[PDB]
């Protein structure tokens, strides 16, 4: 049976065995070197339209936890920036560390943050997510760093339900969550063409990584670390360090929306 | 639920809705125009090594029937011709018509044959079939036309078990079958880069189409037409005309191994 994770035997260094695209030309995440990621004046402002977002459920999938949204209409969309057309929010999730000093997938001048939020969107041109993931312009992932600091009020609804989804396969109803409460005030960003950061590592993502982190409390992120990778009745494996390290940039350009 | 077939609503003209590669650059089958499919003196002879082929089962999958082989070792392999490396036989199946005058997928100067046999092989470089289908050179399909004429003795073992797999999902044990009994005397061929001829229509196939048809009797092909596309208990839909028509060659070259 096929399995993957973040452990010694099944972790990122081994993903290439079952998923040879892991050594591909457009893999994510990457380190963002601010000396070489140049301002591009042709980049437009990002348009985030989340005012009508409709969350449905929250699920522990054994790798992270996803908050899933109704993506049957343009209720929560990303437009503008480097994108053509309309990208619908389907889910968000996080990657995080075992310690406050690590957890993010993207890094900025090699700096790691405590966690990283991924808001995952698919291009409506392709009809559904399953077709979109097969296209180079299929997905747009908005990535937001989490820096340990003040508590984030808009995260607390998430933190408060995590005890109900401790183990793999558990889910809960999760309505009326406002994803606007997870955004920073500035939407200045970096963008590059990349991939899913988990198997199957498909190269279908326009990455949009925000410059400004959001602040999370030490206690809020500690709650994330109480989750389990494993199923109920299996040996405890705490859900920590579920991040893939920076991959080679290869021929790619990272463009900045800001000076 | 996702479905496809050969009917009015779900047939080849509609496959593009769920499988947009249907309109791609390397789709199969094609018409082989013998005035433009030029002899290539750099093409090697085809090496067919089926003396140790180990058949396992025969299955009605609701689209055709497959004879499946044990592909754990190099027991039945295709080498040479246009191929680099070793391609293991995994299964064979046929496409056929409702009438003797149609049924083949490839055509030769627009001529249709009563049926076409596909012997499906995967490139061992890629580890298993599931990874091979993700690569442009992942599969090699040896295609053999069936012309109505004398009975083919080597086909009779197949014909004799079809009553046991009439409907979708039925299978039977099917051991010691000799696929050499389905080959013509000459291995002269045409070759071109193409696709699966059924959804998901992946562009992963080196096609090797033999010049010389095999015969089959009018009664043998009539037996194929008694199979059902449908499952047990569903309305009868006879398994006939399970062929995709010729697709545009676009800028591809069809090379002949013979003058
Ligand atoms: Zn992610
Ligand atoms: Zn076929």
From Swiss-Prot, chains A, B:
Describe the location of the Alpha-carbonic anhydrase domain by residue ranges. Answer: 2-258
Any one GO molecular function term: arylesterase activity
Q: Where does substrate bind?
A: 197-198
**Record note on pH:** Optimum pH is 6-8.
Residues that the record marks as modified (N-acetylserine) are: 1
Q: Which SUPFAM superfamilies match?
A: Carbonic anhydrase (SSF51069)
Q: What cofactors does this protein use?
A: Zn(2+); Co(2+)
Impact when changing residue 61 to T: Reduced activity
For the site Fine-tunes the proton-transfer properties of H-64, which positions are given? 6, 61, 66
Q: How, per the record, is this protein's activity regulated?
A: Activated by X-ray, histamine, L-adrenaline, L- and D-phenylalanine, L- and D-histidine, L-His-OMe and beta-Ala-His (carnosine).
Q: Output this protein's name.
A: Carbonic anhydrase 2
| The organism of origin for this protein | Homo sapiens
Give the organism's phylogenetic lineage.
Answer: Eukaryota, Metazoa, Chordata, Craniata, Vertebrata
